[PDB]
Amino acid sequence: VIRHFLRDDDLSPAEQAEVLELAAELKKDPVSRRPLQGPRGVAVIFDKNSTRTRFSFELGIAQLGGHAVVVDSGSTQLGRDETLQDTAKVLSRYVDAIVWRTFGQERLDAMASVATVPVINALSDEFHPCQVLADLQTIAERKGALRGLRLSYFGDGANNMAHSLLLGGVTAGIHVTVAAPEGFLPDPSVRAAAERRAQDTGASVTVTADAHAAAAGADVLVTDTWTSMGQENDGLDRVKPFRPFQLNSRLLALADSDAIVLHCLPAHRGDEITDAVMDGPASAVWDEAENRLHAQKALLVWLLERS
Amino acid sequence: VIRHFLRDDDLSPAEQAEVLELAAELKKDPVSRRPLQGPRGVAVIFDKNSTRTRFSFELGIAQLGGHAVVVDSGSTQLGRDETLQDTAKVLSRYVDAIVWRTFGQERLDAMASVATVPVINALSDEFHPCQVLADLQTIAERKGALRGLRLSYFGDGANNMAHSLLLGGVTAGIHVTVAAPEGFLPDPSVRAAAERRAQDTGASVTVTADAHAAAAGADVLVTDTWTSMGQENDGLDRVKPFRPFQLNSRLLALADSDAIVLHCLPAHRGDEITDAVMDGPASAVWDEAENRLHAQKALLVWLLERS
Amino acid sequence: VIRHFLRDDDLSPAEQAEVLELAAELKKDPVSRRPLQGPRGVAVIFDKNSTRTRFSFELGIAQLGGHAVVVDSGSTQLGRDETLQDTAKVLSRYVDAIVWRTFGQERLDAMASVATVPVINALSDEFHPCQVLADLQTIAERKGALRGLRLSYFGDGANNMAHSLLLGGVTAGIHVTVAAPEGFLPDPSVRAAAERRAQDTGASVTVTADAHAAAAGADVLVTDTWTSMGQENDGLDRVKPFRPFQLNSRLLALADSDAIVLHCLPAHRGDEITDAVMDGPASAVWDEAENRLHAQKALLVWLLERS
């Protein structure tokens, strides 16, 4: 019955494609779709920091005719231990969708399990699915057909972006490669889900510790922070392992000539990515960030007309 | 000139009836009254946690045509000791009403003493009058006439809910009973005010330490947390005295067969209310929370046309 | 191309009069200009506490038909060290202007250097130009023309208000005097720029340690806090030096008989300004606060049609 979006494969390949096509339509006509007219509300809850997600969601919602109630969960009664399920049943009386940036996926599942409106993952510890929709809209407007392109991700292969690039990348027909060192590879379960979905789309999943091989011939190079939110006090050395995986000019010179570079941001310039690459001719980082707005609006128009 | 809503008896019986009738009408047509179109502003200021108050005011104001400016007081100049009177005088220059969730009642009185727009209590240590209007709206849509109903509240009978249920209840013509251990009875001057208001409406006020007597034949049964915001560090055991006052199936079984159960939320499941009661057939808990939206809109409309 | 408002002299004198003429028209017809209709977004970012700037900007954007995204910067990725240039380039994809209350002026220069939308100083350690636009509107509406009035500022002559009164005063043709102890004097390059602007408008700049001589004959007396945000820990006694500079009944008695008193707020009553003055017949303080709303809206309309 009600459609949620907690992870990238919650959209079938055909569904993802309808979303991305609508994304491109909304980018060209931003304020003419008003499913939340009223204004109907949408909850937008943050447990972690945000710039791109906060702005793109709040504005998108307003552009759909609705009203984002944007909160830090700590100042809600979640900070005083109201259960996630009571919260979600309450929010279901006020809003038409619940967008949440959180820690463990289990938290999203708890709310999704009783909510009577779409729950949307605005970033968890294990996935960042709205980002990869914006990533894919950006690749599509630059390259055309998504099916059969090669995309390589570099760095922490166990974080939310690695995971979502895998699931959303194969959902789109894309051969995805994760280049990561050995403490830091995708979760087996996510890798299994990606392989499962790739079978239906013609895609493939490669996981390697050879950055040079991952880069070579690639159509899209992607990276992300070596230390994500939640990982600060994990005690690991998060510099030494990742140095070989830095997205720099040696690396990019191995890719296909028309290759593009993505980074979800915020970037720690000099670490995972260098200035010359980020501010170079291949970077699509600013268009990528912008698409957060157009992609999430499409997602929401699509989820709402199905719920 | 100027009507504030700082505690429940700030409305007369006839006025409360006007507000509740309008609450009913706005539930039916939520966007048909737009007295704040423009948008005009309303200030919504939080010194404490919230989910239901935050969402229902922010959205209810937007559906009245207006725009809520929602802030934690700690990031305003209130956090650098600007006085409450200066703050109120300045806010009366931007917004058409000031909604404030705070501690001592005296702080609301300080703002209401100089403000030139309605000040509205969105919870204080002593009263929670917007909650009780939602309660009454939910009672009325389930049972019809309010006059003559029998309501009992259980638990911490010294808290804002107990005071507000006593005052809003008897204003509605409802026989109110507060059932609580000896060390947590209503403030006697609140209780006296309630007895005075009861003489006008045919209501009554009862304070009891016997839960079973309070449940017997009750039409509505209400409870709330046993540790309110601001009580966390009073050092008292706030489980043991309250156990006999728990709202569970055996207590509920004593009530009228058509009795309903209310809880303002957030609930501590297994303490003041059991899963079995809260999720049972008698529970009006979620309609109650929805009715915050409607009741506060009605309240806003009424106050604005009188100020 | 694109006009920023980082400091008062960013407007030439003809441009400032355009903005203030607009302010007065918008005070009379507040929803008559909708350039942000859509809604288009505007970033409103806080590094420091705020009441007046928060409410005036948020509501004023809404009244121009747009949507303000209001954030404390600690919650954004600025809190996790994303560079200002990256933040600005990203915001430029989402919003139509960036309003920022911050610390060093160089942070605003950093953003404005790469931003493709107008950056607007909602207060920095150096300037507070939007406040002075509201100050000028409130003088104009009480005294008529601005050219050739006498304005005196008292207290910390090196703070952001001293600098804006200097630059925005002379730009309006106002003879500006700063009365401050000798260790608290306007930054030399701000005084120079003010002297240079005064030559084009026929105004003048005076700086003195003599509070009595500064009050004698003044049309406008202005003060501000002795310890601004950010100065709490400089090690200075910030009471003893400024006592001779207190805006009290004695000093007001020296002014022109039709003099007005202004104070940006928040006020530490009993320090820089007394109750008798603040609350007496010369005080234009509440109207001054309200005019933040009208003056910022005009500035936004004006900047947007030129960017």
Ligand SMILES: CCC[C@H](N)C(=O)O
């Ligand atoms: C947009 C932030 C993504 C990053 N992997 C994190 O969780 O911090």
Ligand SMILES: CCC[C@H](N)C(=O)O
């Ligand atoms: C709505 C919360 C009510 C509770 N008595 C409290 O003040 O915390």
Ligand SMILES: CCC[C@H](N)C(=O)O
């Ligand atoms: C509006 C505040 C003005 C003061 N100079 C400060 O910087 O704190």
